[PDB]
Amino acid sequence: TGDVIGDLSRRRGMLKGQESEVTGVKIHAEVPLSEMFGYATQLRSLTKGRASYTMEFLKYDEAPSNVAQAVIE
């Protein structure tokens, strides 16, 4: 949980809340599409292949100054 969230936060992720079921600790967050690139290749590199995720769209929210200045070609 903490590791996934640290890495969520790292990929500009909004950790939000830490839920729990029976054998799993579920954490839902918001992540940019620009840092989605190869995520499950980096997810199970930190979770020993025992985790999973599913990406859903919410909104075209705010792109910060470092992220706004990047793609301008």
């Binding site: 949980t1 939000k16 809340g17 830490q18 839920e19 729990s20 600790v25 579920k26 954490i27």
Partner: peptide, 9 residues
């Protein structure tokens, strides 16, 4: 809620 999340889980 967001802060009770960590606590609960």
């Amino acid at each position: 809620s967001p802060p009770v999340g960590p606590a609960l889980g």
